[PDB]
Design a protein around this ligand. Sequence first.
Ligand code: G3P
Lengths: 513, 513
Amino acid sequence: FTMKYVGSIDQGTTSTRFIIFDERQRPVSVHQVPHTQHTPHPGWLEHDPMEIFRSACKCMSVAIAKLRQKDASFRKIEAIGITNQRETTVAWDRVTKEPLCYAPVWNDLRTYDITKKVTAELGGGDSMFASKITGLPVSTYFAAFKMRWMLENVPAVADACRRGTLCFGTIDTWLMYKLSGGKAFVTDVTNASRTFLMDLRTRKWSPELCEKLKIPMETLPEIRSNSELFGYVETDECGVAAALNERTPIMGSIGDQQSALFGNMCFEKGEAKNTYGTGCFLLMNVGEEARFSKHGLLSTVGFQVGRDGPCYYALEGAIACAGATVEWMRRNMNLFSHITECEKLARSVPGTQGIVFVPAFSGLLAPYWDPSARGTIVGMTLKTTRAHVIRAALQAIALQLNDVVGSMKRDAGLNLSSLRVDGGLSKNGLLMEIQASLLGVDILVPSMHETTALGAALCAGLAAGVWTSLEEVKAVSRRENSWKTVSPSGSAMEREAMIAEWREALKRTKWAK
Amino acid sequence: FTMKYVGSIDQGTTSTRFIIFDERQRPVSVHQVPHTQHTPHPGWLEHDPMEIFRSACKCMSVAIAKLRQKDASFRKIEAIGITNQRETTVAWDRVTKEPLCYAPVWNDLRTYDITKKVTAELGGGDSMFASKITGLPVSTYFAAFKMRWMLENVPAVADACRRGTLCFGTIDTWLMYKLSGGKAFVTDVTNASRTFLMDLRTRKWSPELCEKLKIPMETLPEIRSNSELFGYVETDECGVAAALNERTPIMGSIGDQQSALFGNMCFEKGEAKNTYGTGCFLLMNVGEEARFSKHGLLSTVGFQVGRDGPCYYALEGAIACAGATVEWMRRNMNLFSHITECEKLARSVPGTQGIVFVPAFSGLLAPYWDPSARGTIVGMTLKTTRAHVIRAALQAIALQLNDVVGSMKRDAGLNLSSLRVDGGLSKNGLLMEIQASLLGVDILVPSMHETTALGAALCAGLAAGVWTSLEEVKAVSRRENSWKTVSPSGSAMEREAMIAEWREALKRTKWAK
Ligand SMILES: O=P(O)(O)OC[C@H](O)CO
């Protein structure tokens, strides 16, 4: 009858976008608004939730305005999905509806005491003691730890639970809270898998863990799926509520990294998405039973397309300096200028010729988690130019990743089928060819730029009937939104000798205080 | 009454220089002639002995001609001295006087196999097996090894030997051959030392080793002192006998690193010379009685003034790179553009932030004899930059010097008086600054640049009465030279710090193969 449109709120660390998709999953309108990165102490990071909510209302308000001008058939939105930076926690109150403090951000560290004050004590020295319930280790990321701090370092939050009005929520929950007026106080499985209070298997809260780490089982929202009806957009803030002419529902909510997988069409095990930037998140779809890991990797919910639908779980890995290495090799090293001499230089040489550049500048994340590791280059000769090191950096991004892949294989019990890539170096043709061969699978690269925001846009489409099933979601993406593939092109006397080289080069990374 | 003059042929690796000196020990005429550096295969290097010879002659002409223009007083030269690249070995013929084939240089590596058969079949295990006669390990550099490679690889060599016509010698004996026309077939202590067929203390052709590696006695030149009669320039090539208005004697012959030792006023033990250009060697005056070493350090002659003079021995200790590291960082790495920016950027930062460069590009030389070692960098952070590297680079140099000095200080029996510098990077404040620091001594940077050439003239000038004694030669030099010095800076707070890095840094260098 009409042309359908699904909106998505991409809620990043630094910026929040609002993106409107028409039913061929085209991005037809975008508006981006950044927000202040308050850093009260070296190691601390927080944001203003009422700033974010505002930014979001700006993007929504503007993206809708812009589209309304260039598309004569756009006349409302079927549903809105939310995707968000994970692990960021907000404190607030049912009856004021304001927030009670600035939200400590995922990588924010004010909680490293409570990290230890939980391992040495409540863990008998084992951070993994709960790795079977939560699918997580103890660390400075998950919403439980950041709640502990607000309860023990802010009276305004300490007082508000004394009351029994205090509300916690990762950004999603918070965003749907204000967007609906205060009505829905709700969350999804992917975000919930990161709170440290949740139960990998059953995807219900952990009264056991809520207990121990002492967060009342009712300062918390409810755990819903990824794709259902969460609520309705009833908030007049900025233009937004007006700009939507009928009561527009929220029908999709999903942690961004999981949204990146889901938006990359990874609905089946083997498939994996990898987002680059300064650093990476490689998430592999692992199937219908939560898989656990020995390499201290993360277990988490990939997605759930409906209140009690087939719940696909996932493993997760990170490296910390990917595009940041490609940045350092410029901003700090003179080795090149434009992102185009870089890939001309690296191709100017056939191989690396015996050298290994381990960009372990913060140490090794990935599968080796070794803080004693440092940036280290071995086996240089006089024959070593700058144009080799730069290729050996492209190898390093691929090689490190391979370890994470390797790891996942061992802890999944299946082979990486293919890999999708986005938001890091999708222009860098060479990296994908050095990457594709090594892993031994097809590396797929999307032409369309907004997979992450499509992730949540597809959770809200489905649930509203913009696309019928996940099987029809593949075909639309198969026909409209192009990919070109990058296919393997190397052999063992390269593929397996490089993996040997890397590891021989790894014993030489150590370099602590 | 008119000014007394003396010549020194300074036949290097890349080029032949001829320099005329007056009694104020000042260079008054100079001429440079380069010669082709043939690399017939990878890791080979040879020169035409005739090219070299003709260059020596074209150098004498111009230097004899320029001198007239400049100071018309000039009628003749008192004596000639010769200084040369050591270990390069020339095959020639006592009849035809032509070279039978080319000449493998000191850094040429065609003598690998031979070395192995030598420490195998003849040596029987230890590379130090003849080191109580030759004062040297069994390796590629030394001249017997190159001698035999020629006996059993060139058709014209052994065939000219079957007739007994064959003649051998390093450049100094070779140049002193065609200068006379054949008349003289001599060599001095410093070059003979380097051959591996001479006893270190008795300066005779090692009767055992002679027949052991097979090199017939007469194929070997008479062994003289550094400072005496040798032959007469009875050659007519580019009219040297002609241009030398009178009959000119040869009263100086000495290897170039010892001549640059002797040209820097290091007549008493504990004083050391550090030279640049192709390579970098430290040589410290050990004393009148030879001090043998256990570390891979070369015991060698320092100098012998006349038949019946005191022979100070010394210890060597090679290091390939100096301005080589800098050229790599510049050329290969594009880390900067001009050698102006090296010291700039390196000074332009406080320190190395816990990195260490190891510019062991073609192995690790010095007292740590390790060929598997390659160029490495350890300890990098996202805050490390292109200048922290350039800083680290120049610190790896002196730290390496340190250990060779520590090897001597040990095996020699004394500490360190003073050390002087010459070559491409002697004009480098920071370099001698760190070296002054690390070693704990004064470092004199000398105004008269070309002091290697001085050495041989000094052997020609003492022998010919132009100068009377070294202490007088010290006083003469004093009446012309300016001490641009650098002294130590720091305690254990700074010294044992970057060293501590150094030790463990090095412990991560073994890579090759
Ligand atoms: O001529 P150089 O400056 O390359 O020095 C080479 C050494 O004398 C070889 O022992």
